Design an enzyme around this catalytic site. Structure first.
Site, short mmCIF file in Angstrom:
data_model
loop_
_atom_site.label_atom_id
_atom_site.label_comp_id
_atom_site.label_asym_id
_atom_site.label_seq_id
_atom_site.Cartn_x
_atom_site.Cartn_y
_atom_site.Cartn_z
N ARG A 1 -3.23 -6.56 -7.96
CA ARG A 1 -2.40 -7.46 -7.34
C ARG A 1 -2.56 -8.80 -8.27
O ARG A 1 -1.83 -9.41 -8.82
CB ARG A 1 -2.17 -7.56 -5.79
CG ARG A 1 -1.28 -8.73 -5.41
CD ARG A 1 -1.43 -8.97 -3.83
NE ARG A 1 -1.41 -10.25 -3.62
CZ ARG A 1 -2.49 -11.25 -3.82
NH1 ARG A 1 -3.97 -10.51 -3.59
NH2 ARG A 1 -2.61 -12.33 -4.24
N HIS B 1 0.78 -1.24 0.01
CA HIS B 1 -0.01 0.08 0.01
C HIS B 1 0.71 1.38 0.28
O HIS B 1 0.81 2.20 -0.71
CB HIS B 1 -0.87 -0.10 1.44
CG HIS B 1 -1.86 -1.06 1.59
ND1 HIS B 1 -1.83 -1.79 2.64
CD2 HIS B 1 -2.64 -1.88 0.46
CE1 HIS B 1 -2.78 -2.75 2.50
NE2 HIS B 1 -3.50 -2.73 1.27
N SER C 1 -2.61 -7.26 3.42
CA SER C 1 -3.12 -7.18 4.79
C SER C 1 -3.15 -8.57 5.37
O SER C 1 -2.77 -9.03 6.33
CB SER C 1 -3.95 -6.32 5.07
OG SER C 1 -3.80 -5.14 4.86
N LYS D 1 -16.87 -7.19 6.77
CA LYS D 1 -16.27 -7.95 7.66
C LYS D 1 -15.43 -7.22 8.54
O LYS D 1 -14.42 -6.37 8.17
CB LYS D 1 -15.20 -9.11 7.12
CG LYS D 1 -14.94 -10.06 7.93
CD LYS D 1 -13.56 -10.83 7.87
CE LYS D 1 -13.25 -11.77 8.88
NZ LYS D 1 -12.14 -12.50 9.21
#
Lengths: 173, 159
Positions: free
Chosen positions: B91, B18, B129, B42
Site C-alpha cells: 500500500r 485485505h 486496520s 503491539k
C-alpha cells in the site's frame, strides 16, 4: 456445468494463469532471467513481451533483443518470447493473459508502478498486476548500467548470460 | 503442479482491502491461507480467536481459502503448511522498504518460498486496520471499509 455457466474468474477457486512480462530488455540481464524464472515457477505460462519501439533508441534492435532472450530462456518450457508494439494492456488482451509481471527494484518507482497498475485496471479489469522483488544479487543492475560499464571496459560477465555478453562485446567495437 | 500461498498479517481487524487482496490471490493460486499472527509485539484490539473468527466469516465464500493463526517463524509455518508462495499487499512506499528487507531475510531462511506483491485496488488504497479503528473510535462512519460481521464487532468493542 457448461450448459448453465462458462464460469467467472473470481470467487470460484484457482484458474489457468498466463502472465506477460513486458520490457525493452536491451539486452536481457540475469536480473530479468531471475524475475521470469520465479514467475514461471508459479504461473502456468509466461510471455516475455519485448517492446518494439521504446522512446529511447535501443542498442539492440527488436529482432536482436528477441533472439538473445529466446536463447537465454529456452531452458524454461512454459516461457515464450515475443515482440509487441502496443499498450501492455492491449497485448495482454490479444494474448488472453490474466497476469502482468512487474519487477520492483526501487522506492523511486513504487508510485509510478501503482499508478500504471491503476491505469491497467481501468483498461483491462481482468488483468492482475503482480510485483516481484529482484534477488539481492541483481538488485543494483540494469540493462542501462551494464551497457555503460561495458562501454568503458568494465567486467560485466557476472551479470549477463554468455550469448548476451558476446553480442554486447560485438556492439562495443 | 499445485500452488499454495500464505497471506500473513495481524488483521486487527480484517478490512475490505485485505479481502480484495486475498480474493485476487485466491484466483491465481490453488490454495491460500490467511495467516493471522498470534502474538504481534503491539497488543491488538481483537485477540487471536476473535481475529480468526471474523476473518473466517468474511472469507467463507472463497472455497480455496483457509484462515489460520500462527506463532512461529513464517518460514517454519510455510514449511509446515507446505506453502511455496508468500503474498503481501503493498500500500505505502514505507511498507515496500520493510517488506523488501523481510523478503531478503525470508530468501535466506527459506529459498524455496517465493514472495509476491499485490497493490491494493484504488478504492482501498488509503485504508488500513489502524486508520479505520482511529476513525471509528471517534464515531466516524467506516461502514464502507469493513464487512458487516467485522463492523458490528468493532462497534461492540467501542461500546
Amino acid at each position: 456445468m457448461a450448459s448453465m455457466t462458462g464460469g467467472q474468474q473470481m470467487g470460484r477457486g484457482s484458474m489457468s494463469t498466463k502472465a506477460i512480462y513486458p520490457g525493452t530488455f536491451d539486452p536481457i540481464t540475469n536480473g530479468h532471467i531471475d524475475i521470469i524464472t520465479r514467475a514461471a515457477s508459479m504461473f502456468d505460462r509466461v510471455i516475455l513481451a519485448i517492446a518494439a519501439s521504446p522512446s529511447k533508441k535501443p542498442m539492440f534492435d527488436l529482432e536482436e533483443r528477441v533472439a538473445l532472450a529466446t536463447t537465454a530462456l529456452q531452458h524454461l518450457p512454459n516461457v515464450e518470447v515475443m515482440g509487441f508494439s502496443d499498450l501492455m494492456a492491449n497485448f495482454a488482451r490479444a494474448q488472453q493473459a490474466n497476469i502482468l509481471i512487474r519487477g520492483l527494484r526501487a522506492v523511486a518507482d513504487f508510485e509510478y508502478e501503482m499508478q500504471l497498475a491503476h491505469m491497467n485496471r481501468h483498461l483491462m479489469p481482468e488483468l492482475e498486476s503482480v510485483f516481484l522483488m529482484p534477488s539481492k544479487e541483481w538488485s543494483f543492475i540494469s540493462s542501462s548500467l551494464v551497457k555503460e560499464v561495458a562501454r568503458h571496459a568494465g567486467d560485466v560477465t557476472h551479470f549477463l548470460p554468455a550469448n548476451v555478453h558476446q553480442a554486447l562485446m560485438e556492439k562495443l567495437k
